[PDB]
Enzyme design. Sequence first.
Site, PDB file in Angstrom:
ATOM      1  N   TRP A 218       0.822  -1.205   0.000  1.00 33.61           N
ATOM      2  CA  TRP A 218       0.000   0.000   0.000  1.00 33.61           C
ATOM      3  C   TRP A 218       0.858   1.258   0.000  1.00 33.61           C
ATOM      4  CZ3 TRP A 218      -2.205   2.496   5.062  1.00 33.61           C
ATOM      5  CH2 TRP A 218      -3.213   3.433   4.714  1.00 33.61           C
TER       6      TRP A 218
ATOM      7  N   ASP B 243      -0.080  -4.766  10.741  1.00 28.23           N
ATOM      8  CA  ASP B 243      -1.198  -3.989  10.276  1.00 28.23           C
ATOM      9  C   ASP B 243      -2.407  -4.940  10.098  1.00 28.23           C
ATOM     10  OD1 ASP B 243      -2.902  -2.161   9.178  1.00 28.23           O
ATOM     11  OD2 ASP B 243      -1.622  -1.511   7.526  1.00 28.23           O
TER      12      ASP B 243
ATOM     13  N   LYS C  68     -12.982  -0.066   7.316  1.00 23.65           N
ATOM     14  CA  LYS C  68     -13.423  -0.935   6.209  1.00 23.65           C
ATOM     15  C   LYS C  68     -14.520  -1.881   6.682  1.00 23.65           C
ATOM     16  CE  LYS C  68     -10.515   0.708   3.157  1.00 23.65           C
ATOM     17  NZ  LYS C  68     -10.403   1.950   3.962  1.00 23.65           N
TER      18      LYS C  68
END
Length: 383
Positions: free
Chosen positions: A117, A198, A233
Amino acid sequence: LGLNEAFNADTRPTKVNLGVGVYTNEDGKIPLLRAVRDAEKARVEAGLPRGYLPIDGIAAYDASVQKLLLGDDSPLIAAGRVVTAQALGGTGALKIGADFLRTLNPKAKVAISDPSWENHRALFDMAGFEVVAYPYYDAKTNGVNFDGMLAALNGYEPGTIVVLHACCHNPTGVDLNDAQWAQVVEVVKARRLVPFLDIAYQGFGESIEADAAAVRLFAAANLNVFVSSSFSKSFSLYGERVGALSIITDSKDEAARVLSQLKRVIRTNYSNPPTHGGAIVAAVLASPELRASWVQELGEMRDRIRAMRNGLVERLKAAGIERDFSFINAQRGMFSYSGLTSAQVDRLREEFGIYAVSTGRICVAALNTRNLDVVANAIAAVL
């Protein structure tokens, strides 16, 4: 922003945006989760303002996050070895973690996955770390270059920060299995590396419980483990940075020290009160009834994505494409690396109005039964 702007401007009726990074339902809409609707209806009926939390609300949220990571009756939670700082105010947990790690050792290198990312690289580079990449995605196999990954880790100096996606790899969807997690943990421990996990997509891979496996494996290795949780999300809260930074430490004494340093770093740097969205997540995770509703709906969302992965592979086959696309079924979360070249992605867009990232990243969560054939048949034409 840019792929999106171009898609928004495209005047063709059959256009599809696979470049996005959010979940949509069968109707192609961003859902309002039932738990979120119901937390809000409760707040409004009680007459309270956006952002509200009760007197023990932040503590109850921190506790709920630790349980999502480690299980409801973890011994680490028992021993006082887990410290959590809320990130409900628009400063994400990844930033709080980067700032904290920079106070401990500003000379550390940071190692991120090849590819990762854009924001992993930007965040750590901006923060002043030298950022390197470890081998991860293997374009030849559509899987992990695991020999390359371990050799890289085995070459890093002590204190090097290794940023690992716990599950639902962004951008590739290629995840480690456990043989692999176990070997990574062993190397991280032997080399005195600092793991920073993460977990922004917990619940989108296998299950809420399974998606935390990497966190539980590191937490059992008797070392300090940094964890960035993010919930925007899974709650379908576009643009929110809601999450929490958790640190599992190797002793109760190490936790006391880490917590005192963390408090001083946060008080010095930022005092951001909970946002509207941040308070929604806190209220939901704190309530057994709302939490159960979220867990159920996140399951439905996870299962729709699995149905789309299965469906895309079947429709790609039905369209007569000779390539083996079975890897789409082995990939997890919102994303897959499709394996299309940048020229093939240009053709998809220009000739068919199907928008993917130049890297071949597609958002499988943007697929639905009304666009599967449109997408599959276009990929076939370009290949």
